[PDB]
Structures are given as structure tokens and as C-alpha cells.
Amino acid sequence: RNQQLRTLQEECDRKLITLRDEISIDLYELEEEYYSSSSSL
Amino acid sequence: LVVPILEPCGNSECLHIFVDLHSGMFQLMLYGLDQATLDDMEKSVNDD
Amino acid sequence: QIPSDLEGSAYIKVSIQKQAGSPHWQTKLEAAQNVLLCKEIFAQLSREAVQIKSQVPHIVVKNQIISQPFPSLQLSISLCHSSNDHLYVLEHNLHLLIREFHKQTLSSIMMPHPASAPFGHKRMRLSGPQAFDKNEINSLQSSEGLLEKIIKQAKHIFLRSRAAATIDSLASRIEDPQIQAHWSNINDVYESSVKVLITSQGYEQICK
Amino acid sequence: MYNCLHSFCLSLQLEVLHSQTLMLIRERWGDLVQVERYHAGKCLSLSVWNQQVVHKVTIKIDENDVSKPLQIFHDPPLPASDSKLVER
Amino acid sequence: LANERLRALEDIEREIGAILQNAGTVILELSKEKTNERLLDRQAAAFTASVQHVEAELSAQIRYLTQVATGQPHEGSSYSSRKDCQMALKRVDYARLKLSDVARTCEQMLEN
Amino acid sequence: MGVTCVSQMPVAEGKSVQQTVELLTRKLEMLGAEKQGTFCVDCETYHTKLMYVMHNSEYPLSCFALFENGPCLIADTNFDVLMVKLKGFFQSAKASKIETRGTRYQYCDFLVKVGTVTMGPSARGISVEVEYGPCVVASDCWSLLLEFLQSFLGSHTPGAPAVFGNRHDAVYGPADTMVQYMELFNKIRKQQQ
Amino acid sequence: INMMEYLLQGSVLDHSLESLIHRLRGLCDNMEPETFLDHEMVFLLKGQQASPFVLRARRSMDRAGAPWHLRYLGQPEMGDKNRHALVRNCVDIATSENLTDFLMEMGFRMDHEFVAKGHLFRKGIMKIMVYKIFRILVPGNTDSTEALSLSYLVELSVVAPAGQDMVSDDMKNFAEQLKPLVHLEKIDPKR
Amino acid sequence: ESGGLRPNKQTFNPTDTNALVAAVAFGKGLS
Numbered sequence: 067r068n069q070q071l072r073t074l075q076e077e078c079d080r081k082l083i084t085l086r087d088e089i090s091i092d093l094y095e096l097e098e099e100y101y102s103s104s105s106s107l
Numbered sequence: 108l109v110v111p112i113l114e115p116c117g118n119s120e121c122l123h124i125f126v127d128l129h130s131g132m133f134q135l136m137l138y139g140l141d142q143a144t145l146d147d148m149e150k151s152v153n154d155d
Numbered sequence: 156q157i158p159s160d161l162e163g164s165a166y167i168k169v170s171i172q173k174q175a176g177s178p179h180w181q182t183k184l185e186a187a188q189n190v191l192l193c194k195e196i197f198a199q200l201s202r203e204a205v206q207i208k209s210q211v212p213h214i215v216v217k218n219q220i221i222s223q224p225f226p227s228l229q230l231s232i233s234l235c236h237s238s239n240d241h242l243y244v245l246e247h248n249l250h251l252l253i254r255e256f257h258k259q260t261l262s263s264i265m266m267p268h269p270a271s272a273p274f275g276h277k278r279m280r281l282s283g284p285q286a287f288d289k290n291e292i293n294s295l296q297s298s299e300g301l302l303e304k305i306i307k308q309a310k311h312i313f314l315r316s317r318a319a320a321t322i323d324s325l326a327s328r329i330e331d332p333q334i335q336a337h338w339s340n341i342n343d344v345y346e347s348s349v350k351v352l353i354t355s356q357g358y359e360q361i362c363k
Numbered sequence: 364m365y366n367c368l369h370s371f372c373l374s375l376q377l378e379v380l381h382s383q384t385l386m387l388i389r390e391r392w393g394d395l396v397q398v399e400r401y402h403a404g405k406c407l408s409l410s411v412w413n414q415q416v417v418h419k420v421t422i423k424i425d426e427n428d429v430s431k432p433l434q435i436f437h438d439p440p441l442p443a444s445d446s447k448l449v450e451r
Numbered sequence: 452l453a454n455e456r457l458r459a460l461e462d463i464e465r466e467i468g469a470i471l472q473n474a475g476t477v478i479l480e481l482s483k484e485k486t487n488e489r490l491l492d493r494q495a496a497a498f499t500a501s502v503q504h505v506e507a508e509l510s511a512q513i514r515y516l517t518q519v520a521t522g523q524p525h526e527g528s529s530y531s532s533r534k535d536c537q538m539a540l541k542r543v544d545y546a547r548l549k550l551s552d553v554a555r556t557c558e559q560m561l562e563n
Numbered sequence: 564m565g566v567t568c569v570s571q572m573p574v575a576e577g578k579s580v581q582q583t584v585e586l587l588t589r590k591l592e593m594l595g596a597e598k599q600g601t602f603c604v605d606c607e608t609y610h611t612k613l614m615y616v617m618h619n620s621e622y623p624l625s626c627f628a629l630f631e632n633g634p635c636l637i638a639d640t641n642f643d644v645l646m647v648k649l650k651g652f653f654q655s656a657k658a659s660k661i662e663t664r665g666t667r668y669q670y671c672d673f674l675v676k677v678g679t680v681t682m683g684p685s686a687r688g689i690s691v692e693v694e695y696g697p698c699v700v701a702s703d704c705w706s707l708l709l710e711f712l713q714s715f716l717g718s719h720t721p722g723a724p725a726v727f728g729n730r731h732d733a734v735y736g737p738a739d740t741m742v743q744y745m746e747l748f749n750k751i752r753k754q755q756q
Numbered sequence: 757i758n759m760m761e762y763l764l765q766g767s768v769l770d771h772s773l774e775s776l777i778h779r780l781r782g783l784c785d786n787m788e789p790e791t792f793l794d795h796e797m798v799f800l801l802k803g804q805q806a807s808p809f810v811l812r813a814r815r816s817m818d819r820a821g822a823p824w825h826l827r828y829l830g831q832p833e834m835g836d837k838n839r840h841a842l843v844r845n846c847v848d849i850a851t852s853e854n855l856t857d858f859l860m861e862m863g864f865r866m867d868h869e870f871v872a873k874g875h876l877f878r879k880g881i882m883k884i885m886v887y888k889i890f891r892i893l894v895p896g897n898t899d900s901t902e903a904l905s906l907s908y909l910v911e912l913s914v915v916a917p918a919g920q921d922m923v924s925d926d927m928k929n930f931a932e933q934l935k936p937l938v939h940l941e942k943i944d945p946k947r
Numbered sequence: 948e949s950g951g952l953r954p955n956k957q958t959f960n961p962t963d964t965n966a967l968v969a970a971v972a973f974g975k976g977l978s
Contacts, residue, residue, distance in 0.1 A: 067529050071536035078543050085546065090340045097337050104356070106330040109226075123226055127212040129205050129395040131412030136210050136226075185537075192534075201391040215391065243545050250538060258531070261787060266878065269825040270794040270814040272848050273759075273915070274883070277822075283624030283639050284823045284850045286737035289600060291696070293623065514955055521779060523933055526879070527786035614862070633861045634854035638826075641849040645828060648847070652803040652863075765968055772958035798974070868974040889970065891977040904970060904977060907963045939959040945972035947965070 124152075161187035163238035167196060169245040170231050171309065175221075190236070196253050196301070197234040203300035213302075220302075224310045232305070248308060248344070252301055308344045315347050322351070366427070373424050373432050374404045380422060381407055408438070458512055465505050472498040564736045565696035566704025568712065569743040570721035571750055572677075572689045580679050580686045587677040587689075588666065594675075594715060596668035602676055604744060605662045607643070610654030616643065617741045617748075621667070621674075627741040635738040658683055661748040663690045672697055673711065680751045688751040691716065692743070701726060701735040761829065761846040761915040762924040764931045766940030767907040768886065776910070779937050780877050780884055789875035792887075793818040795898055796872065797856075799864035811864060813855060817871070817898065823850035834942070839921070840928045842942050846915050871901050874908065881914045881923045882930060910940055 111121040123136040133152045135145065164186050176182065197218065204213045204220055213222040219233035232245075259265075268277035282292050326334045335352040342348075355362040381401055388396060399408035399419050407422040421436045428434075442449060472494055479485050487494070574583035607616040613631045618640075626642040629635040636642075646653060665678025674694045679686040693711055698704035705727035712720035725746070726739040768776045781789070795815050800808040812829075816822040830845040860866070874887025888908045890901030912931055914923045931940040969975050 068532040071529075071532045075536045075539040078539050082543060082546060085550075087340075089550075094337065097335075101326060101333075101335040107327070118227055123211070125212050128214055129212075129392060129411075130416040132416060134210065134212055188530075198390060202393065205391055205395055206393050243541075247538065247542060254531075254534060254538075261531075261785065263787075263790075266787075266790065267876070267883070268819065269816055269822045269850060270792065270796075271812075271827045272825055272850065274878070279624075280639070280850050281821065281823060284637055284852060286619075286622035286625040286627070286637050288696075289621055289623060517936060518775075518955060519779070520936065521783060521933055523783040525782045526784065527781060531786070612861075628858070630858065630861055634857045636852055636855055636858045638851045638855075639849050641847055642851075645847045645849060649809060649828075651805055652801050652809060765964065767960060767964040767967055769958050769960065769963075772956070776958075868978050870974075870977055889967070889977075905963060905967065907960060907967070909967050909971075937958065941964075943964055943968040945968055947969060 157183055157187050161190050163190070163236065165190040165193045165234065165236045165238075167193045167246055167249065168231075168233050168235050169242055169249070169305075170233075170240040171242065171313070172229050172231060172240065173227075175229055192250070192253065193234060196249055197232075199253070199256075199300075200232060200249075200302050200305075203302040207300055207302070209303065222302075222306060224306050225313060228313060230306065230309050242312075244312075245305060245309065249301065249305060252304060256301075311345050311347070318349075322349075369428070370404075370424070373428065376432060377404060377407060377422060377424065384409055455512075458508065462505065462508065465501050465508075469498050469501040469505070472501070564699055564734050565694050566698040566701055566708060566735045567692055567694040567740050567743065568705075568708040568721065568723055568727070569690055569692040569740070569747055570712070570716075570719070571680075571747055572691055572716065572719050574679070574689050580689070583689065584665065584677060584679060587691075588668075590715065591666075591668040591670075591675060591677070594668070594670050596670035596675060599667050599669040599674070601664075602667050602678070603662070603664050604678070606660060606744075606748060607646070608656040608659035609646075610656045614654070615745055615748075616646070617744045618643070619737075619740070619744070622737060625737070627737070629738075629741055629745055635741060637737065659752070661752070663744070663747070665690075675715075680748060682751060688754065690744075690747045692740070694740075699734050700732060701739070702730065702732070704735070757917045757919075759846040759848070759915050760833070760843050760918045761913055762841040762843060762927050763942075764841055764912045764927060764940045765943050766910050766931070766938060768910055768938045769907050772938065773886070773908055776886065776937050777875065779934070780886070783934075784877040784879045784884065787878065789877060791818065792816065792872075792874065792876050792885075794872045795869065795892075797869045798867040799859050800867050801864055810867070811859070813851070813859070824853060824855050825849070826851050826855065832945070834944075839924060840942050841924045842944075843924070848915070866895075869895050869898075870904070871898060879930065880926070881916060882927055883913055885911050885913075887911075910938065912940055 108124040109118075109121050110124065113120075119138050125134045125136065126132070127134065133149065135148055135152065137145065166189075200220060201215050204215055204222075211223050211226075213220055215221075218236070219231060222230045222232070224230055264277050265275050266277075267274040268280065272280070276296070279293075279296055287293050322334065322336050326336075333352075333354040333356060335350075335354065337350040337352075339348045339350075352363075381398075384396070384398060384407070388394070388398070395411075395413070395416075397410045397413060399410045400421075401407045404424055406424070409420040410417050411420070412418055417439070419437070419439050421438045423433045423436055425433055476491065476494055476498070479487050479491055485491065572587075574580040576583070578586060602620045604617060604619045606618075608614070609616075612633075614628065615631075616626060616628045618626045624640050625637050626640050627635055627637050628642065628646075661680055661682055663678035663680045665676055668675045668677075672695065674692075674696070676690075676692045676694075678690050680688045680690055691712075693708050695704050695707060695711075698707060705723045709720065709723055724739060724743055726735070726742065777789070793816065795817050797813050798810055799813070800810050802808050809828075812827050814825045814827070826849045828845075828847045833843040833845070834841075869892045871890045871892055872887040873890065874885055877884045886908050889904040891904050892898060893900035893902050912927050914927050916923050934940060966975070970977050
């Protein structure tokens with residue numbers, strides 16, 4: 067049971083990290099946008 | 108007790124004196140004060 | 156048959172306030188184990204809050220720990236026992252810290268690294284053999300509390316939030332020169348980093 | 364009947380409080396609160412803010428507590444009159 | 452562990468069989484015309500054999516326990532791995548929730 | 564392991580060994596160095612070729628056994644317990660127990676320790692050790708420590724350790740520090756007068 | 757204070773190693789086995805005293821940066837029959853690699869060398885080691901060794917202060933409860 | 948029937964334990 071659960075957890079973590087990575091790239095794009103917006107209230 | 112040192116000042120830079128509900132001793136919390144002077148002042152306060 | 160006082164569902168609640176399936180038996184057993192773990196967590200927290208000296212002393216009334224990490228905020232760590240604003244990050248950190256403290260005894264490190272020794276802290280053994288310094292690589296050699304670490308983490312989170320909001324306002328209010336911020340990918344529980352840039356609207360290249 | 368029932372329930376409350384105090388001393392407080400004197404059915408004295416890091420809180424049962432479970436008595440200090448706090 | 456399962460099955464089967472045999476034999480005993488003479492003797496033999504077999508099987512199975520028996524209740528548990536995995540799953544669920552909320556806000560933006 | 568240098572500075576003059584230590588404390592206050600605790604060194608001697616054991620407070624649980632030019636074993640404190648107990652096949656030598664006890668002053672990443680090798684009950688001499696924890700490589704800080712000693716100590720600044728004399732890029736080590744302590748002890752003993 | 761080590765020694769044939777290990781893991785604290793390889797060298801001083809001081813130095817060949825261990829174990833203190841354990845004075849000191857040269861320059865002369873391969877389990881204070889002694893083939897050749905005998909060696913040991921003895925009673929009870937799979941008894945070193 | 952001396956698998960050899968302890972002590976057949 068231990069091996070199974072550990073593998074499951076690790077796979078989950080890998081997926082999570084890659085997500086963190088993808089979400090971070092999206093965040094970078096948005097941070098480069100919103101900040102550069104003309105707007106000027 | 109938030110007692111201020113100087114008249115023109117904000118929330119920080121004022122002596123925050125607390126009382127431990129379990130012990131009763133006085134504990135002072137200054138932002139940038141060194142820990143040795145802090146415990147010395149704590150002892151001097153708890154004495155009198 | 157669930158043991159008494161382990162019945163119902165319990166979940167520790169940590170909040171920051173700017174004021175003042177399958178097998179049935181499995182569910183019962185897991186709920187009781189989680190209740191026991193949360194009870195141990197809160198017992199350790201209350202003991203460290205009461206019997207350990209620290210700045211800005213804290214208040215424990217029945218099952219709630221009210222602390223002032225900063226002079227202008229309140230941290231409430233209260234155990235909620237149902238007996239039939241929540242920051243899950245701090246609860247997860249509490250659970251992992253308690254599990255680490257539990258694993259400390261079963262730690263593989265402290266288990267006679269060499270052979271026929273005394274079975275204790277092989278890092279400290281190597282430090283004593285290699286003549287380590289008084290405080291450097293010794294001093295306390297891990298001697299903190301769950302409450303202290305949790306408070307430090309909460310303070311860091313608040314500071315980060317504060318800086319973020321401040322820059323946002325600066326970005327919304329002041330629009331003439333520019334403002335930019337690129338938060339780092341990897342952070343820590345007691346640290347973070349940004350990259351502020353102040354360019355112009357049209358001349359990005361030269362105004363660097 | 365009322366006198367007997369009242370005496371019994373007040374004595375039961377007395378140690379329901381004594382048991383709670385010893386449980387608090389065991390787990391959380393840890394010598395931060397102490398038991399000065401406990402008389403079963405007469406009074407129970409709890410001391411807080413000890414001299415190390417004194418005051419007592421007595422849970423008396425005297426004569427007839429006609430008005431209420433004998434209003435508690437903070438014997439040593441007799442705290443000052445704070446309208447909001449002394450009522451609680 | 453299917454070995455233990457098969458053992459139990461055989462046990463139950465043999466027991467039921469022997470009980471039925473005894474029933475039939477006593478029914479033929481009260482019978483006014485016991486036509487099953489040799490048949491009855493065969494049944495008796497079978498029942499005896501069954502009981503002997505059951506006894507032997509039981510003794511062997513009991514030893515099986517003694518070989519692993521020690522009285523000690525055994526400490527080693529999977530509590531560590533289980534707790535870790537539970538924590539991980541809860542964390543992933545929280546992440547999914549946050550992602551869904553952000554997606555919903557983006558949908559709202561598009562809806563105007 | 565941070566490059567270190569130890570030398571004997573004459574207490575000299577009519578200034579009492581202890582008063583000379585007070586003058587050294589005044590010089591350390593002038594540097595702005597602040598006390599960071601206390602340090603105690605004690606030694607055990609065994610006539611046999613030649614066995615010396617030096618232990619320094621800064622390293623709390625280690626006991627160093629040095630065999631002259633032969634290798635130094637850095638071992639846990641139990642080592643002292645064991646040598647004492649076995650004793651029968653160990654030379655008792657004499658009361659050569661040499662100890663230097665003095666304050667530790669920390670100046671920006673340099674720890675300076677000035678102490679009086681008190682022989683037995685009577686003080687005689689003075690040992691100064693400047694340790695640079697950031698500098699793990701010997702020779703690179705043989706130069707740094709000579710410069711720092713010329714800066715404070717001024718006159719009577721030494722010529723640097725024998726391991727410093729040896730030309731290697733090898734990391735310095737608490738071992739060489741114990742070696743220096745040993746040579747220092749040897750110097751007061753032979754010095755006599 | 758001095759450290760006394762309680763030792764109960766018994767043997768297991770290899771064909772029962774599997775079963776023994778299984779039972780051991782099941783009863784012992786929830787850990788994986790540590791799989792330890794240790795090379796031990798014995799050095800003796802031929803002093804004026806008839807008895808020669810014997811110091812054993814062990815280096816882990818399976819791990820990196822693990823300090824050599826010097827252990828001194830004196831004469832047995834066994835007296836009463838109501839303990840069933842070898843109580844001996846134990847001094848254990850972690851040491852640097854130069855230890856070999858230090859000891860030979862100090863006079864200590866190397867005696868024999870035996871590598872040991874086996875598993876380590878701990879139950880509370882108690883530590884159970886099932887190991888096999890491989891008589892080194894060629895003292896220089898740690899690589900080549902000779903299994904001394906087919907049977908592995910099971911040792912149950914508790915090293916505690918002399919005043920403590922409840923732990924030794926616990927060790928005796930635990931060995932007795934391991935009797936159905938295998939027998940651990942106090943065997944005198946003599947013959 | 949009847950019953951004889953049949954312990955289920957004997958895994959202990961006393962002569963082997965004695966030899967092992969003696970070797971650990973006097974280094975027999977180890978040099």
C-alpha cells in the first residue's frame with residue numbers, strides 16, 4: 067500500500083509543479099500586460 | 108499600553124507594553140530595539 | 156467502535172482578521188485519526204503559547220489562540236470540534252510540521268550512522284568529530300516551536316500582501332512614469348522576491 | 364427539598380470546576396495557575412499571576428446562597444470597580 | 452492468502468457433509484426397514500474418515516498460526532505514507548478549487 | 564575551518580600579566596570588537612613517542628590528540644574519558660597541564676582571542692589567535708592574517724604558522740589550530756626565566 | 757557515567773533468514789531495514805599487564821562520510837542468574853580516518869579483520885542486528901572475503917547507563933518472545 | 948495412531964552459535 071500511495075502522491079506532485087510552472091508563465095504574461103496598460107485614470 | 112516616545116509619530120516607534128494573562132509580567136515590544144536592552148528594560152520594569 | 160472524544164468531525168481553523176467513496180468504517184477511522192491529530196496539534200500550540208517566553212504574548216481562552224504578530228493585526232488559531240477567511244495553507248503547514256516532529260523520532264539520520272555507536276543525530280556526531288563551532292553548526296541545533304514558526308510564516312504572508320497592495324495602488328494611482336513588477340516563481344515560507352522596474356510609456360529601451 | 368437539591372447541585376458544580384481546573388493545570392497552563400485551597404462543598408481557591416513569573420479566586424458555598432450559587436469571591440485583591448469587567 | 456480461504460471452504464464443506472451423514476444414519480436407525488445395510492456401513496466409514504480429515508487439517512492449520520505467532524501485537528504501520536498521501540490529495544483539491552475560481556472570473560470577464 | 568594565526572605577545576614591562584591582558588582588552592575595545600562569550604583550552608601530557616591532547620571551548624564536543632609530527636585524531640569527548648580510564652599502558656608524564664583562558668572578541672568576521680597560558684597555578688606569557696571563518700583556504704589568509712596583525716598588534720606581529728609555511732591550497736583545519744596551540748605551550752615551557 | 761551494553765546472541769540458518777526478517781519487521785518499530793556493511797579491524801597492545809587492551813575500529817563501506825567508530829568492550833560483569841544477559845563496560849568514540857595511522861604510531865598492532873553484511877532493526881532502545889561475518893580474503897582485499905559459516909548471527913543489544921537494568925529485562929523478554937522462529941541466549945565468549 | 952518428536956523446522960544450531968561467539972572473541976578460522 068505504501069509503495070502505491072507514494073507513487074500516487076509523487077505523480078500528483080509532478081503534475082502540480084508543472085501546473086505551478088504553467089500558471090506562473092501565464093502570470094508573467096499578465097504582469098507584463100496590466101502594468102504596461104495606458105488607461106491613466 | 109501604546110505609549111509614544113516622541114509627539115510626532117505613527118503607530119510604530121512607540122513602546123507597546125503587554126501583560127501576560129498567564130504570568131502577569133510586563134513585556135515591552137519596540138520595533139528596532141536590541142534584545143539585550145529589551146530584556147534589561149523588561150527586568151527593570153517588572154522589578155518596579 | 157470509535158473511542159470516546161474521537162467521534163464527530165474536527166478541523167483546525169486559522170484566520171487573519173483586521174479587527175480587535177468506499178468502506179464505511181474507513182470514514183469513521185480516518186475522521187477519528189484526524190480529530191486526534193488536530194487535538195495533538197492544538198495541545199502543542201497551547202503549551203508553546205503558555206510555557207514559552209516570546210515577544211507580544213498571546214491569549215488562549217478555551218480552544219482559541221489570539222495573537223498579535225504585528226501591532227495592527229490579529230491571528231486567530233482555533234480548534235473547531237463539531238461533534239456531530241480560512242487559510243488552508245497555514246493548516247497544511249501545521250499538519251506537516253506536526254508530522255515532521257513525529258518523524259523526528261523515527262528519523263533515519265538518528266540511528267547509529269556508523270556502527271556500535273549511541274544512535275543520535277549523525278549530523279551532530281560529524282560536527283563534534285570535525286570540531287564544530289560554539290553557535291556556528293550547533294548553538295541550538297533545531298530548538299523552535301510550532302507557534303513561533305507559524306507566527307513567522309503568518310507575518311511573512313501579511314508583509315507580502317501589504318507590499319503587493321501598495322505597489323498595485325502605486326500602479327493605479329501614479330501613471331505618469333511607469334511601474335512594473337515580476338514576482339519570482341519559487342518563494343519560501345519566510346522570504347519572497349520581486350523585480351520592480353520604472354520605465355517610461357513610450358521609451359522602454361533607453362529608459363532602463 | 365429545594366435546600367437539599369440546591370446544596371447537592373452546587374457541590375457538584377464545585378468540583379465540576381475543580382476537575383476543570385486540574386485538567387487545565389495538567390495540559391495547557393502548566394503551573395501558570397495553581398490551586399491554593401479546595402474544600403469540598405465550601406470553597407475552591409485558584410491562584411493566577413504567581414510571584415515566580417498571591418491572588419486567589421474562591422468559589423464559596425456559605426449558609427444559604429439564596430441570591431445565586433454563592434456569588435464568587437475574589438478574596439485577596441478585592442478587585443476595583445470596573446463596571447463592564449467585574450460583571451463578567 | 453487464498454490458501455487460508457480454500458482451507459476454510461474445505462472445512463465448512465466437510466463439516467456440513469459429516470452432519471448430513473449423521474442425520475441420514477440416525478434416520479435409517481429409526482427406520483422399520485433399514486434396506487441400506489452395506490450402504491449404511493459405507494456411510495459410517497465415510498463419516499469417520501471425514502472427522503479424521505477435519506481434525507488433521509485443523510491441527511496443521513493451527514500450527515500455521517504458531518509459525519507466525521509471537522504474542523507481540525506488532526508495531527509497524529502504514530500511518531506515515533497514508534497521512535502523507537491524504538495531505539497531498541487535499542492540497543491538489545485546494546489547487547483545483549482555486550484554478551476553477553480563476554477560470555470562472557475569466558469567463559465573467561468574457562461575458563461582457 | 565577558517566585560517567587562524569596564534570602568537571605569544573610579551574606581557575613584558577612592569578605591566579602585570581593580568582594588567583597587560585587588560586591593556587589588550589582596551590586595544591580590542593578600540594577596534595570596536597565585542598565579546599561573544601568565553602573560551603577555555605586545557606592540555607593532557609603523556610611522555611609517550613610523544614602524546615599531547617589539546618581541547619578548545621570554541622569546539623564543544625571534540626577532543627584533539629596530536630602526536631608531534633604524527634597525525635592528529637579529532638574525536639568525541641568520550642576520548643578523554645577513555646584515555647583516562649585505560650591509563651595503565653599510558654605515560655603519566657608530569658603536571659605539564661598547560662591552559663590558556665581569555666575573552667573572545669568578534670570584529671566583523673574576525674574572532675580575536677588573547678589569553679594567558681597559565682602554567683599550573685601561575686600565569687606566564689600570552690597567546691593571541693586571530694581566526695577568519697570565511698577564509699577556508701590556508702596561505703590565502705596566511706597573507707590576510709599577517710596584514711591584520713600588522714594592523715592591530717602592530718610590533719611583535721608573528722611570522723605565521725608552519726602549516727602556513729607549508730605551500731598547499733589544502734583547507735586549513737582545526738588540526739593546524741591545535742598544532743599552533745601545541746607550539747605555543749612548548750614555547751612558554753622552554754622560555755622559563 | 758559509564759555505558760554498559762546488554763548483549764543476547766543467537767544464530768539463524770540462511771534458509772530461515774527470510775521468515776526471521778519477516779517476523780522481526782512485523783514486531784519491530786515501523787522502519788525499513790538499514791542494510792549495513794561494516795569492516796572491523798582489531799588492534800591489541802601487548803602491555804606489561806598480561807591482558808592486552810583490544811580496540812575495535814569499524815568503517816562503513818556502504819556509506820560515505822560516516823565516522824570510523826572506536827569501541828572498547830571490557831570483561832563481562834555477569835554474576836546473578838536472574839538477568840540472562842552479558843553486561844560489559846562500553847566506551848564508543850566516533851573518530852577521523854587518520855585513526856588507523858594514529859593507533860599504529862601509538863603502538864597498537866592490528867589483529868584480525870572481518871567484514872559484516874546484514875540488516876539493522878530497532879525496537880525502542882533495543883536494536884536487533886542480523887549479520888553474516890565474512891572472514892576477509894586477503895587482509896588488503898576488502899573486496900574478497902570468506903563467509904565464516906552458513907548461519908547468520910542475530911545480536912540483540914541495549915547500551916544504557918549501569919544504573920538502568922529495566923531495558924535489559926525488556927531485552928530478555930523480547931528474545932524469549934522470538935523463541936518459536938529462533939533461539940537467542942547469553943553464550944559465554946570462553947570456548 | 949501416536950505422535951513422535953517432530954518440531955516444525957528446527958532453525959537453531961547450538962554448536963554453530965558457540966563457534967560464532969568463539970570466533971567473534973578469539974578470531975578462530977578467521978585468520
